[PDB]
């Protein structure tokens, strides 16, 4: 009916799905997300990798870094970049946000992205929400600007929900 996590030795029931754990494809043991030093974001992303990418515990992993760790790292960057290129390639948003005049604009977001400094979906989305909301606060009551900013806002939210279904973009602290 159960066993113990091979790392922390806490017990678990085979039928208890109210936990955050991964099951090793080789020994069948379950390991806590925390025991692999995985954040909640990474656990969600891991849950979405292809079935062909098996999780393997520390005991059953013969080659380090484990294949799932490589796939997870790449999947995160790919997913983030996906959203960023879609914005950079969007005429309207690029127009209004890529170049302005800590990321002050989408170009700043890219430099950060390229330097490999983005790990958190929350931080990435927050940086973009800040840029969008900043444009909105300075619409100047100009109606064509508002319509435009409202459109890039919905576009961003849709891009985020599709790439990161488990993430609440609408809850961002930076929306006003």
């Amino acid at each position: 009916s159960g066993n113990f996590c091979p790392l922390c030795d806490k017990c678990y029931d085979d039928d208890d799905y109210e936990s955050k754990m991964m099951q090793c494809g080789k020994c069948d043991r379950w390991v806590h997300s925390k025991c692999e030093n995985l954040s909640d974001e990474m656990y969600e992303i891991l849950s979405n990798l292809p079935e062909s990418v098996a999780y393997t515990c520390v005991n059953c992993t013969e080659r380090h870094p484990a294949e799932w760790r490589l796939a997870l790292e790449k999947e995160l960057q790919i997913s983030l970049k996906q959203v960023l290129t879609a914005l950079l390639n969007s005429r309207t948003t690029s127009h209004l946000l890529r170049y302005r005049q800590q990321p002050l604009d989408l170009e700043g977001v890219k430099r950060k992205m390229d330097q490999g400094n983005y790990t958190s979906v929350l931080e990435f989305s927050d940086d973009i929400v800040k840029i969008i909301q900043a444009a909105i606060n300075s619409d100047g009551g100009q109606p064509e600007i508002k319509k435009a900013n409202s459109m890039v806002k919905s576009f961003f939210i849709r891009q985020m929900e599709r790439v990161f279904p488990w993430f609440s973009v609408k809850k961002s602290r930076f929306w006003e």
């Binding site: 991964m22 849950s47 098996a54």
Partner: peptide, 6 residues
């Protein structure tokens, strides 16, 4: 990768 969510 199999998780409790999978």
């Amino acid at each position: 990768a199999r998780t409790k969510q999978t």
